[PDB]
């Protein structure tokens, strides 16, 4: 089923940061800030863990849309193959969350791959879930309105503990 | 893709 980082990475703090850095044309910047709240949620809501949210400067999780190389070392690759990653918990690239802006992205009323389901991946990503062998696992290595599995749901509280 | 560092 779920798997974690080697060594269990995670946040140490009961708040972390998070910051909406880059946006994608392809939608309205306050339906991106209320998607990435949402996808945060559906793992906040099951461990003892808060999300606070920062628009200037540095935070815990930096989130954004990016065109080709852009600071790490895995840059982006165009339209198709690659379409996002995130790294796990750490200081400085720990936690933060990139998508490729060579994509399309939809909140679900256009063509486009879901941004809340994308999201929701890489966020696990950015608190230390990695993939899980089970299909029905939002985790699951592979793109394929949900709910997390109760394979997600397990790993996070292993991690983290319940709330 | 998840990436430790
Ligand atoms: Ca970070
Ligand atoms: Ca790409
Ligand atoms: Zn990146
Ligand atoms: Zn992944």
């Known amino acids: 089923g779920y798997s974690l980082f080697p060594n269990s990475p995670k946040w140490t703090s009961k708040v972390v940061t998070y910051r909406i850095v880059s946006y994608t044309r392809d939608l309205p910047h306050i339906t991106v800030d209320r998607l990435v709240s949402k996808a945060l949620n559906m ?23 990016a065109r080709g190389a852009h600071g790490d070392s895995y840059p982006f690759d165009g339209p198709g193959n690659t379409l996002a990653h995130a790294f796990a918990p750490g200081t400085g690239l720990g936690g933060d969350a990139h998508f490729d802006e060579d994509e399309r992205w939809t909140d679900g009323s256009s063509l486009g791959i ?15 879930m990695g993939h ?14 949900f709910k997390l599995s109760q394979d997600d749901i397990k790993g996070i509280q292993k991690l983290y503990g319940k709330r | 893709x998840g990436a430790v560092x």
Not at chain 1, 46 to 64: C, N, Q, S, Y
Not at chain 1, 137 to 145: L, Q, R
């Open chain 1, 43 to 65: 793992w906040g809501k099951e461990i003892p863990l808060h999300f606070r949210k920062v628009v200037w400067g540095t935070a815990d999780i930096m989130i954004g849309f």
């Open chain 1, 114 to 128: 879901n941004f809340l389901y994308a999201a929701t991946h890489q966020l696990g990503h950015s608190l230390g």
């Open chain 1, 132 to 145: 899980s062998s089970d299909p029905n696992a939002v985790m699951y290595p592979t793109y394929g309105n």
